[PDB]
Amino acid sequence: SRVFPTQRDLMAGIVSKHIAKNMVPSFIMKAHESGIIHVHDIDYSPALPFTNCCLVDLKGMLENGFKLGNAQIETPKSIGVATAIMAQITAQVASHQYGGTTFANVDKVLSPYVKRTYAKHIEDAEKWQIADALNYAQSKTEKDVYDAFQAYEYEVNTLFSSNGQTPFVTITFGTGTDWTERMIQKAILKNRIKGLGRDGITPIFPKLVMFVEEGVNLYKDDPNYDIKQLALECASKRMYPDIISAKNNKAITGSSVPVSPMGCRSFLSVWKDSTGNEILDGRNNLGVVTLNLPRIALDSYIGTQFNEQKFVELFNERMDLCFEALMCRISSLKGVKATVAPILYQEGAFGVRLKPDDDIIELFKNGRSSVSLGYIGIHELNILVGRDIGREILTKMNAHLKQWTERTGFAFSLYSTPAENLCYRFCKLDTEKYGSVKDVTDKGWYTNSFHVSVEENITPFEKISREAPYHFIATGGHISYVELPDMKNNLKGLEAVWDYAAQHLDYFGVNMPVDKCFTCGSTHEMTPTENGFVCSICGETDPKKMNTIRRTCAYLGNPNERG
Amino acid sequence: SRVFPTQRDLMAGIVSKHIAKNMVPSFIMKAHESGIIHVHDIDYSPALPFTNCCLVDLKGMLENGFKLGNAQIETPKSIGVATAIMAQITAQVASHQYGGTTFANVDKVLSPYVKRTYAKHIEDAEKWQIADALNYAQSKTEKDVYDAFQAYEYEVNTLFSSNGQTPFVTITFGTGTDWTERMIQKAILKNRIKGLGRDGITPIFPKLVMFVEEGVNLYKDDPNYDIKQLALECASKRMYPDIISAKNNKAITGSSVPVSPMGCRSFLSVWKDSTGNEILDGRNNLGVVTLNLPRIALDSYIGTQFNEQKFVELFNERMDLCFEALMCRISSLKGVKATVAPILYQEGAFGVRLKPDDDIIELFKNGRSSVSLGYIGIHELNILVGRDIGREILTKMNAHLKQWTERTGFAFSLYSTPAENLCYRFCKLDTEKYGSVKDVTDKGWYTNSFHVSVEENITPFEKISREAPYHFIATGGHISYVELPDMKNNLKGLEAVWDYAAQHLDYFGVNMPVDKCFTCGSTHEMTPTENGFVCSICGETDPKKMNTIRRTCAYLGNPNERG
Numbered sequence A, B: 001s002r003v004f005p006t007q008r009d010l011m012a013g014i015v016s017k018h019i020a021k022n023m024v025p026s027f028i029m030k031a032h033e034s035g036i037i038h039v040h041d042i043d044y045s046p047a048l049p050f051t052n053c054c055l056v057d058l059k060g061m062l063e064n065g066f067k068l069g070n071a072q073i074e075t076p077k078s079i080g081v082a083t084a085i086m087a088q089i090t091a092q093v094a095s096h097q098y099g100g101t102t103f104a105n106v107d108k109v110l111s112p113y114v115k116r117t118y119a120k121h122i123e124d125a126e127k128w129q130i131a132d133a134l135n136y137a138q139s140k141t142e143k144d145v146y147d148a149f150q151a152y153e154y155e156v157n158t159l160f161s162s163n164g165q166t167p168f169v170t171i172t173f174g175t176g177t178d179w180t181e182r183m184i185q186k187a188i189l190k191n192r193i194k195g196l197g198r199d200g201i202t203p204i205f206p207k208l209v210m211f212v213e214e215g216v217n218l219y220k221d222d223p224n225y226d227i228k229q230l231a232l233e234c235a236s237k238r239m240y241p242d243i244i245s246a247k248n249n250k251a252i253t254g255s256s257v258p259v260s261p262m263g264c265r266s267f268l269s270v271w272k273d274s275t276g277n278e279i280l281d282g283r284n285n286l287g288v289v290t291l292n293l294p295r296i297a298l299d300s301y302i303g304t305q306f307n308e309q310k311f312v313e314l315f316n317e318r319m320d321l322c323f324e325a326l327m328c329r330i331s332s333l334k335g336v337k338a339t340v341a342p343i344l345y346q347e348g349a350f351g352v353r354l355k356p357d358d359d360i361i362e363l364f365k366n367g368r369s370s371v372s373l374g375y376i377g378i379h380e381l382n383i384l385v386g387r388d389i390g391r392e393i394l395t396k397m398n399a400h401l402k403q404w405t406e407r408t409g410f411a412f413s414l415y416s417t418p419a420e421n422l423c424y425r426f427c428k429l430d431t432e433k434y435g436s437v438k439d440v441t442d443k444g445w446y447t448n449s450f451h452v453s454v455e456e457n458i459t460p461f462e463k464i465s466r467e468a469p470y471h472f473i474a475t476g477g478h479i480s481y482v483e484l485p486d487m488k489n490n491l492k493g494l495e496a497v498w499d500y501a502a503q504h505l506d507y508f509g510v511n512m513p514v515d516k517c518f519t520c521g522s523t524h525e526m527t528p529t530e531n532g533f534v535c536s537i538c539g540e541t542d543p544k545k546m547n548t549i550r551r552t553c554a555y556l557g558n559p560n561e562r563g
């Protein structure tokens, strides 16, 4: 935060909010200022025409050529070089949009390049007359690939985005059986288990999402079932990888192939080009405006009594407000040329190649890009109205969303905002007006989207069952977590929730304690002190002598830096 | 320029100049505003405590460990990984200072890591029972190293600094004979000749400076004389590498080892630590304030007549002004903690490891860091005063500089400002007051530092001879160029100027036409049109179908983007 690149970003942030204050209609800013809604990234958009997140079309760029910076890159002739260009792209893309960036199916996209490192090695055992032909190659290739993903793993943690930060990047895999594809998968997983750096700590990025599917990943007999096992190990030691149910995913998205989340959890919906092809990679999201659901209910109290009709009034009113807010920023996009971000619009990233002087707004119309109507705190809302209305209000929302899509041509969808930050702001702005409302603003924060309350006491299986239906309503983005104790040696139980989840819902992640004592090397849950974590079996307390990760909200982090 | 990262940098720039307007004493800003002096980087410093340029202590970082971003890196066990960490460091450092960044003697620093790629390969020909032991290794290692520097070459052109730009980076080599050291040298050189990207164009960065020295690089019998030959080829095809006379360099700097330039041409002077060791790597420069020499003379005209005494008055007056300006920004550095730029002050970069809460100002005191008093236009000055006073005014300047050093403890030195940009601004600000003064402001720009006028008509040998003495007066930074026609096949003549130069001066570069037609593949000087370059032997004119580089001022660039 005192670091230079950050100071600089901050400057551009202050200037941006200032310009926003002037571009955004007074009534929308007012609502944002007071917590009715929340216009995300007001420190980037609409001051400059940034977009949000995306699925980089890596196959397109690496396949054909592309210019990156000053280099007109050619197709990689080796695996290591591809995961380099990828780490470089990760950085450039992170610097031309204010949202997460995702490389979907690296196992399948990067496969060709393993097949080249192999070719190269076979032609080498054959040049130097080596005993084992097919055996040299295997080995060398297995290594080249581990190193290649160890490079990526590190480069994502050493390369900075223009705002002076590590790229928020997501890598997905799992639907590949070819030997090269399987090789990348174990490559990614072994590296993560290994840990980042000298002390093999749990990296916070890149996120790892593995698709699990019947006949590939989840049954004792399926081909990559061994991979599932390494995956369970990995997750029990570093949280990631999260898993996505290929079955429910396809069903919910409408795509014939599993849809990877752009960033944390923004899902695209199936879309086709002029020639009728389902396009996934290269597509993106235009932004997010989150609706403070609790605040709708609170604002519609008469005295200390909830008034149902008042709710129906403000709801419809705030629904329109949100549409006006989203449409505001989308319009700011008119006139903007491709000159604004070459790797996105001119070279491969967004899946097309626009001329410099082309408008960028057309590339997003008619459903290619998605737009987010975010919500939060279904729990506190229920408490305020007196009954679970979650499944249904979210549904009254898709209804509006559908009308919007039809009137504007933009593909709007229900997004369950991660709100690592918003969970506090809204509560705080609401507390400012309503004081400490029991069970609502009292705890200090709101529960994520449709998640069960933490303070509730259910069974992992019961929790996923209570949430699963939402994975089908809030299609724009969604995820479910369940808390388990150390599972390092109980992978069967861990695999039991994964299995149950992969059946009933879509995007799933299980977060359990992942700690490491540097002095004593204890992979056991440190016990919390009124002053941090303490090593049970070595008494270690100095924070610098340990790595303590916990996914308290959306990302992982050391909970000893917050209070 | 419409590109996002740049828009953002711009915002932070406007905010920074604004804050400077408030921090910098009115009289200094006034002088800057009017062209008497020129406070460089007012868009970074003093708004934030940035520093200028430096020699990264890569040996220190790679040797011991170091944290970069989130990764606690360990010593490279392979050559490719070292030139990766280097490309990553290049980026991080470029993002914590507003000046060039240099990696001195990559041949010697990176040597160990070639010796490891070799070890690894020998142990492999020995594991797979390969025919040629020492021969497999050689080959594999020779390749690993070419690839390693081809990665660096590219990564410097694809990685961005926080301001949305390719790092201004300099790589030096040449004083190494070990086989590994020689290997890096040819590695660097072959890659450059190869060209950047699909169309093998002349990269603009990283700059290449090779030290040439008797008994190593420049005589038919010396060991790396073959390298000199590849070097001459390289330079004739891509401008770089520039050369530095190890003999005169040591002499001028006082260092026992050739001193590499921080950035374009900022030379350090020999300095020692508490234990009496000459330290080079890790040292840096605090900044630059350039004095408009011509403007001193013009301002000291009485009517249309130059008045000598008036000159002596303003000169002494402006000399003090410059000192007050430099001291201004240096003071802004008091209080600043190491938390401001970890890779520089906490991890290896600046050669020491400060605690977070340590002040950074102490690290620069008592001569470790240099400070720049820049000057420009010795030619126009001569014309205004009526006689060459260059060698001597620069000398009256070192005198002041020496007093400053003694009063402040900071190591001030005469810097011959590159002024790729300033060469026009000063002239323009002066023209604003004196109209079009014959031979001075009339041409539109001022001649760099002590360089002979372009419009003059001398012999390469005569030009270097007229400049050489300045390489010994303006010790803070200096360089000489000479213009030659295509030399692609005349390396002996090219080597003749290099040889003559390496004898009489210090930092040398020869710029000749380096063009390439993409449609016809003609490495011949395109002939200039009132509308760009035209291919002689293929008539090609479309700019996109060619790469036309020319070092018109300090950097190389396509002269078809300016007018």
Ligand SMILES: Nc1ncnc2c1ncn2[C@H]1C[C@H](O)[C@@H](COP(=O)(O)OP(=O)(O)OP(=O)(O)O)O1
Residues within 6 Å of the ligand: A147, A150, A151, A152, A154, A155, A158, A197, A198, B072, B073, B074, B075, B076, B077, B078, B081, B084, B085, B088
């Ligand atoms: N491509 C990379 N970019 C940045 N840091 C890297 C990269 N690859 C590895 N590192 C980090 C991790 C460790 O601190 C150290 C490892 O170097 P190195 O041992 O060469 O890696 P490696 O695992 O590919 O090789 P090996 O298996 O030979 O040890 O550098």
Ligand SMILES: Nc1ncnc2c1ncn2[C@H]1C[C@H](O)[C@@H](COP(=O)(O)OP(=O)(O)OP(=O)(O)O)O1
Residues within 6 Å of the ligand: A072, A073, A074, A075, A076, A077, A078, A081, A084, A085, A088, B147, B150, B151, B152, B154, B155, B158, B197, B198
């Ligand atoms: N480390 C790197 N980072 C970014 N781009 C790179 C890197 N290495 C090479 N490139 C670019 C240059 C070309 O457009 C293309 C070359 O890929 P590749 O052919 O694998 O390089 P190479 O020269 O190391 O291998 P080879 O000798 O096998 O061709 O990618």
Ligand SMILES: [Fe+2]
Residues within 6 Å of the ligand: A517, A518, A519, A520, A521, A522, A535, A536, A537, A538, A539, A540
């Ligand atoms: Fe411990």
Ligand SMILES: [Fe+2]
Residues within 6 Å of the ligand: B517, B518, B519, B520, B521, B522, B535, B536, B537, B538, B539, B540
């Ligand atoms: Fe041509």
Ligand SMILES: [Mg+2]
Residues within 6 Å of the ligand: A077
């Ligand atoms: Mg190649």
Ligand SMILES: [Mg+2]
Residues within 6 Å of the ligand: B077
């Ligand atoms: Mg290693």
